[PDB]
Design a protein around this ligand. Structure first.
Ligand SMILES: [Cl-]
Lengths: 45, 315
């Protein structure tokens, strides 16, 4: 079977500061939405 | 790059399947053809009957596929079929089953959007029990509809135009290609089915593990097409009929991060489409806007029309 990643929420750690600061902003930035799913901590923003 | 590598893996892995049962399709005997058709037959009828009105019949089809594929015998036209000591038949049936799942999203979900969900739950449970069938589902889904990866095929020099129109997913006869309206509908149904697979899970069976192709792949898909320039009519079409099918499950799973993604396409990606699309082909972008204006002020995305309910699972 071929490698496929299946994580619903990516951990806050192991995540790049780029993607962290996009999730933490009140608005996203066009052309830089993170590919990985958001983390569990910032679903209540 | 990361995604295109993964795309090639599933592609080249499906190509290895085309060769592993080589000689089962390439034969001139009377019995070699009788087996091939009988397996191709007893592996696609169940999926064709998925257009159902009760969970009681939808489970009959699920078990009929699971039996045929696990080694057990199954009822086909006239006589019962088996697969034990058919090592080519096992790898052959997973291919024909995986393509029939996509063919139904291509010639049934395109015409009737409601049929995506009964086909998605059944495809999701078989993927769960047989992850090889699921990788074959992604292989055909990806080639027939590259916009589901997502990746936009590029204008190629050095290759024939028909081969390039094949890349775009256009259905081509020996003479000519299909129109755009019939092609855009085929592409819609293929991602409405895919948007249904990543959110539904087969209820019965008591599965310890995670969703086979989880709802996470729905987040990246939206992220991965919105960070690239939109195509004139395709993107605004496929974007809408994806959010209508999986916007509800994505709102619940990703509460605020999805709304941020929605107040962006309205503010930033909508102006992006206005320049690229002529006044002659705005029909898609206008329905993409009517769909949001409701959802944005309602603070909720409607459940997809045709979602399976409790009454269905008792019937
Ligand atoms: Cl991936």
């Amino acid at each position: 079977i071929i490698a496929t990643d299946n994580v619903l929420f990516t951990p806050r750690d192991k995540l790049t500061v780029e993607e962290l600061e996009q999730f933490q902003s009140k608005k996203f930035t066009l052309g830089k939405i993170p590919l990985k799913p958001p983390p569990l901590e910032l679903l209540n923003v | 790059d990361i995604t295109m590598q993964w795309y090639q893996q599933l592609q080249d892995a499906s190509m290895q399947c085309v060769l592993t049962f080589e000689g089962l399709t390439n034969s001139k005997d009377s019995q070699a053809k009788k087996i091939k058709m009988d397996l191709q037959k007893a592996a696609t009828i169940p999926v064709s009957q998925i257009s159902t009105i009760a969970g009681s019949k939808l489970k009959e089809i699920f078990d009929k596929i699971h039996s045929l594929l696990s080694g057990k015998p199954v009822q086909s036209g006239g006589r019962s079929v088996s697969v034990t000591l058919n090592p080519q038949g096992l790898d052959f049936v997973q291919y024909k089953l995986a393509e029939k799942f996509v063919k139904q999203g291509e010639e049934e979900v395109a015409s009737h959007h409601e049929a995506a969900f009964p086909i998605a739950v059944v495809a999701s449970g078989i993927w769960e029990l047989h992850p090889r069938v699921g990788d074959l589902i992604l292989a055909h889904l990806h080639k027939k509809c590259p916009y589901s990866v997502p990746f936009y095929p590029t204008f190629k020099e050095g290759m024939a135009l028909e081969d390039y129109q094949r890349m775009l997913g256009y259905q081509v006869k020996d003479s000519k290609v299909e129109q755009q309206d019939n092609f855009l509908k085929r592409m819609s149904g293929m991602i409405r089915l895919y948007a249904a697979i990543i959110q539904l899970r087969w209820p019965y069976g008591n599965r310890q593990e995670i969703h086979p192709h989880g709802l996470n792949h729905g987040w990246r898909w939206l992220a991965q097409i919105l960070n690239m320039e939109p195509l004139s009519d395709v993107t605004a079409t496929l974007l809408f009929d994806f959010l209508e099918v999986c916007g509800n499950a994505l709102m619940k799973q990703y509460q605020v991060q999805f709304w941020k993604m929605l107040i962006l396409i309205k503010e930033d990606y909508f102006p992006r489409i206005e320049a690229i699309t002529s006044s002659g082909q705005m029909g898609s972008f206008i329905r993409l806007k009517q769909f949001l204006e409701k959802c944005l002020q309602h603070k909720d995305i409607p459940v997809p029309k045709g979602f399976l309910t409790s009454s269905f699972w008792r019937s």
